[PDB]
């Protein structure tokens, strides 16, 4: 049957920090993209 698994199981010693940095930059960019909601398409106040 299917066994338990996580995200850092089948990764080498030079891929875990790379994936961490990549996902960190990704979430930081996603948080910075939603900084000016008024200049986009705001709902009528």
């Amino acid at each position: 049957g299917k066994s338990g698994t996580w995200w850092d199981e089948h990764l080498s010693e030079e891929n875990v920090p790379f994936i961490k940095q990549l996902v960190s930059d990704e979430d930081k960019a996603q948080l910075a993209s939603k900084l000016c909601p008024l200049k986009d398409e705001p709902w009528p106040i």
Binding site: G1, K2, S3, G4
Partner: protein, 108 residues
């Protein structure tokens, strides 16, 4: 406390055959790249563990035979050897403990 009646076999079955008391089936059993004697995740293999324990026991036996009596503890590092293998230049101040068997492939 004292029961007023007697529990039935149906109640006993419902109490002892419930999935809460039954042993759960674990899914953490895999194989080992070396030797291979059925290991488990996050747990070291018993075969290599027994091997390294026997090796450490033999090394301690040799150390005790070289030291002799108790209350010693040298102030220098130690290094073990095997059949042949001349001591290197950076291992002059270290205690040499040679064995009487070939060097294994898992000890470098």
């Amino acid at each position: 406390a004292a029961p007023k009646n007697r529990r039935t076999i149906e109640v006993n079955r419902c109490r002892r055959r419930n999935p809460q008391k039954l042993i759960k089936v674990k899914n953490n059993i895999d194989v080992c790249p070396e030797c291979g004697h059925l290991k488990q995740k996050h747990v070291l293999c018993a075969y290599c563990y027994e091997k390294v324990c026997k090796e450490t026991a033999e090394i301690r036996r040799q150390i005790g035979k070289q030291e002799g009596g108790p209350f010693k503890a040298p102030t220098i590092e130690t290094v073990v050897l095997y059949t042949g293998e001349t001591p290197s230049e950076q291992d002059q101040g270290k205690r040499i403990i040679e064995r009487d068997r070939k060097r294994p492939s898992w000890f470098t």
